[PDB]
Amino acid sequence: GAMGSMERASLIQKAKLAEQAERYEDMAAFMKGAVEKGEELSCEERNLLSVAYKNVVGGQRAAWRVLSSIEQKSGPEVREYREKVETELQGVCDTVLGLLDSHLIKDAESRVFYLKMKGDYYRYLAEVAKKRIIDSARSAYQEAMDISKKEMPPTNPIRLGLALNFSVFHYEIANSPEEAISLAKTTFDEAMADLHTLSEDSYKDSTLIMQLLRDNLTLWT
């Protein structure tokens, strides 16, 4: 590995510097090297891995949507460049899914965290695809839902975030707005019903995500 000679702690340190510098490609490479040391990631380290790669693919997805939009309005130049960006985007998704399967997927919260990630990056592959991909995303999301409902409180931010992204999967990908609405409403309603389970160290993230669930419900209705 390109990061094989660097100590794990230095890779984490440099991932944090790259974040401060908004160098998310470097940040993703440092975290990949840390994962490849073979040790589990702490909560803080999981977030760094998520922040790093989600920013990389985010920029690629935004670029792909622009080029795809230009392509629909319509020489081979637009298609060719859209394909170039598409292939690069698929490469990053394959890298993340490879890390998840090879190192990270094996604590309920951590298991849900990584299964949510797998559903996200299969969802990103489905946006440009197929169905062999969507069923992989659903299977990952669904398994993550099963664990979170049994093991984590209804206000837990990982549980809430999983349901939000899973509901987006139902709406945008599966074209199933009914399942997207019921899930988002059930998630929000069950968080409010057991609002007392908010945690002192994560309530800001819980309330943030609860509001984002409400925002999507407002749009979808």
Binding site: K54, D120, L164, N165, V168, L212, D215, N216
Partner: peptide, 5 residues
């Protein structure tokens, strides 16, 4: 409109 980060 997924999870921001």
């Amino acid at each position: 409109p997924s999870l921001p980060x």
